[PDB]
Amino acid sequence: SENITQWNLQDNGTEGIQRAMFQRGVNRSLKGIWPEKICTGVPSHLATDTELKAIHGMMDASEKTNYTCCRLQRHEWNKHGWCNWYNIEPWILLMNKTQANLTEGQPLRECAVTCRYDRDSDLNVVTQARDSPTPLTGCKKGKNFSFAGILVQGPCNFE
Ligand SMILES: *[C@@H]1O[C@H](CO)[C@@H](O[C@@H]2O[C@H](CO)[C@@H](O[C@@H]3O[C@H](CO)[C@@H](O)[C@H](O[C@@H]4O[C@H](CO[C@@H]5O[C@H](CO)[C@@H](O)[C@H](O)[C@@H]5O)[C@@H](O)[C@H](O)[C@@H]4O)[C@@H]3O)[C@H](O)[C@H]2NC(C)=O)[C@H](O)[C@H]1NC(C)=O
Ligand SMILES: *[C@@H]1O[C@H](CO)[C@@H](O[C@@H]2O[C@H](CO)[C@@H](O)[C@H](O)[C@H]2NC(C)=O)[C@H](O)[C@H]1NC(C)=O
Ligand SMILES: *[C@@H]1O[C@H](CO)[C@@H](O)[C@H](O)[C@H]1NC(C)=O
Ligand SMILES: *[C@@H]1O[C@H](CO)[C@@H](O)[C@H](O)[C@H]1NC(C)=O
């Protein structure tokens, strides 16, 4: 409940992962699961490409891996993983389930984080989202939201 889960949503309008997702027909790819403690210093365990590829469906945000694995996946382990989950297997298991739920198209609660306001469609196209509400960035006031196609009135989509 105390852990933020953020992910990316497709958009041909955004340079980087969002466009790569649009092109590959992926609607949502996990960014990370964030507890409150961040992980300064040398990791307990150094994550290997094989362990990171086990988070099936998660696309790397780095152009330099053609938006596949592992830069982003490795970064999340280094910045939020080791110091909080102590061992790689439980983390991988959790990252893979959240991504699986994302891939099923149904996240518990989708909630805008950052938009790219598309003037041509009078829509706040959502680039990143999370499981809980948060202050927005780049979302025009009173304009409708586009969550990987799905049209939603508010920033969040529940309660
Ligand atoms: C929200 O985010 C928090 C992080 O802040 C997160 O909490 C963490 O939860 C993980 C589990 O998901 C938990 O990790 C365990 O830590 C204990 C020690 O406290 C370990 O024992 C566990 O490892 C397990 O044990 C193996 C080794 O131990 C022995 O070996 C045998 C045989 O292998 C095992 O069967 C036995 O367990 C035995 O004891 C390890 O090698 C394995 O990796 C195995 O999994 C876990 O690593 C952390 O303690 C929590 N930390 C905090 C700070 O809360 C929480 O899940 C998040 N929740 C949500 C919903 O997102
Ligand atoms: C993935 O989705 C399923 C289905 O929405 C989640 O399962 C529910 O979890 C709640 C806990 O808040 C339980 O009360 C329900 O019993 C579960 N429902 C079903 C149908 O299993 C699951 O928690 C999600 N997993 C992750 C990792 O986010
Ligand atoms: C990047 O991935 C896509 C889809 O998997 C592919 O069409 C493209 O050729 C890849 N490779 C490079 C080097 O761009
Ligand atoms: C990862 O989840 C996928 C579904 O995306 C499933 O094929 C596999 O069982 C899961 N792997 C692990 C390590 O649990």
Side-chain angles (χ1 to χ4, degrees), residues 94 97-98 101:
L94 176 59
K97 267 130 191 187
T98 30
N101 271 3

PDB file of all heavy atoms in Angstrom, residues 94 97-98 101, ligand 2:
ATOM      1  N   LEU A  94       7.802 -10.026  -7.920  1.00  0.00           N
ATOM      2  CA  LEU A  94       6.845  -8.927  -7.823  1.00  0.00           C
ATOM      3  C   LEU A  94       6.769  -8.019  -9.098  1.00  0.00           C
ATOM      4  O   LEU A  94       5.658  -7.652  -9.539  1.00  0.00           O
ATOM      5  CB  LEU A  94       7.092  -8.088  -6.566  1.00  0.00           C
ATOM      6  CG  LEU A  94       6.201  -6.836  -6.401  1.00  0.00           C
ATOM      7  CD1 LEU A  94       4.711  -7.186  -6.373  1.00  0.00           C
ATOM      8  CD2 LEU A  94       6.587  -6.064  -5.163  1.00  0.00           C
ATOM      9  N   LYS A  97       4.863  -9.841 -11.798  1.00  0.00           N
ATOM     10  CA  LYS A  97       3.409  -9.946 -11.601  1.00  0.00           C
ATOM     11  C   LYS A  97       2.710  -8.623 -11.919  1.00  0.00           C
ATOM     12  O   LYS A  97       1.711  -8.621 -12.644  1.00  0.00           O
ATOM     13  CB  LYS A  97       3.050 -10.440 -10.187  1.00  0.00           C
ATOM     14  CG  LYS A  97       2.863 -11.945 -10.086  1.00  0.00           C
ATOM     15  CD  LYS A  97       3.680 -12.535  -8.914  1.00  0.00           C
ATOM     16  CE  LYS A  97       3.756 -14.051  -8.906  1.00  0.00           C
ATOM     17  NZ  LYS A  97       4.404 -14.577  -7.664  1.00  0.00           N
ATOM     18  N   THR A  98       3.245  -7.502 -11.392  1.00  0.00           N
ATOM     19  CA  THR A  98       2.700  -6.171 -11.674  1.00  0.00           C
ATOM     20  C   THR A  98       2.662  -5.924 -13.199  1.00  0.00           C
ATOM     21  O   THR A  98       1.613  -5.525 -13.736  1.00  0.00           O
ATOM     22  CB  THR A  98       3.418  -5.081 -10.853  1.00  0.00           C
ATOM     23  OG1 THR A  98       4.769  -5.485 -10.623  1.00  0.00           O
ATOM     24  CG2 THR A  98       2.762  -4.862  -9.499  1.00  0.00           C
ATOM     25  N   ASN A 101      -0.060  -7.986 -14.874  1.00  0.00           N
ATOM     26  CA  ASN A 101      -1.350  -7.328 -14.644  1.00  0.00           C
ATOM     27  C   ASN A 101      -1.472  -6.143 -15.594  1.00  0.00           C
ATOM     28  O   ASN A 101      -2.543  -5.905 -16.182  1.00  0.00           O
ATOM     29  CB  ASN A 101      -1.499  -6.897 -13.168  1.00  0.00           C
ATOM     30  CG  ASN A 101      -2.119  -7.961 -12.265  1.00  0.00           C
ATOM     31  OD1 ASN A 101      -2.420  -9.095 -12.698  1.00  0.00           O
ATOM     32  ND2 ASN A 101      -2.326  -7.626 -10.981  1.00  0.00           N
TER      33      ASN A 101
HETATM   34  C1  LIG B   2      -2.914  -8.528 -10.039  1.00  0.00           C
HETATM   35  O1  LIG B   2      -4.325  -8.476 -10.259  1.00  0.00           O
HETATM   36  C2  LIG B   2      -5.109  -9.312  -9.395  1.00  0.00           C
HETATM   37  C3  LIG B   2      -6.545  -9.127  -9.826  1.00  0.00           C
HETATM   38  O2  LIG B   2      -6.945  -7.763  -9.757  1.00  0.00           O
HETATM   39  C4  LIG B   2      -4.856  -8.924  -7.938  1.00  0.00           C
HETATM   40  O3  LIG B   2      -5.555  -9.819  -7.074  1.00  0.00           O
HETATM   41  C5  LIG B   2      -6.441  -9.303  -6.074  1.00  0.00           C
HETATM   42  O4  LIG B   2      -5.706  -8.757  -4.982  1.00  0.00           O
HETATM   43  C6  LIG B   2      -6.521  -8.261  -3.909  1.00  0.00           C
HETATM   44  C7  LIG B   2      -5.586  -7.557  -2.950  1.00  0.00           C
HETATM   45  O5  LIG B   2      -5.781  -6.146  -2.952  1.00  0.00           O
HETATM   46  C8  LIG B   2      -7.280  -9.419  -3.265  1.00  0.00           C
HETATM   47  O6  LIG B   2      -8.184  -8.887  -2.304  1.00  0.00           O
HETATM   48  C9  LIG B   2      -8.090 -10.206  -4.294  1.00  0.00           C
HETATM   49  O7  LIG B   2      -8.452 -11.465  -3.737  1.00  0.00           O
HETATM   50  C10 LIG B   2      -7.287 -10.472  -5.568  1.00  0.00           C
HETATM   51  N1  LIG B   2      -8.183 -10.849  -6.649  1.00  0.00           N
HETATM   52  C11 LIG B   2      -7.961 -11.869  -7.479  1.00  0.00           C
HETATM   53  C12 LIG B   2      -9.000 -12.081  -8.538  1.00  0.00           C
HETATM   54  O8  LIG B   2      -6.960 -12.574  -7.395  1.00  0.00           O
HETATM   55  C13 LIG B   2      -3.363  -8.986  -7.618  1.00  0.00           C
HETATM   56  O9  LIG B   2      -3.153  -8.486  -6.304  1.00  0.00           O
HETATM   57  C14 LIG B   2      -2.547  -8.147  -8.605  1.00  0.00           C
HETATM   58  N2  LIG B   2      -1.126  -8.407  -8.437  1.00  0.00           N
HETATM   59  C15 LIG B   2      -0.168  -7.456  -8.437  1.00  0.00           C
HETATM   60  C16 LIG B   2       1.234  -7.948  -8.252  1.00  0.00           C
HETATM   61  O10 LIG B   2      -0.420  -6.261  -8.579  1.00  0.00           O
END
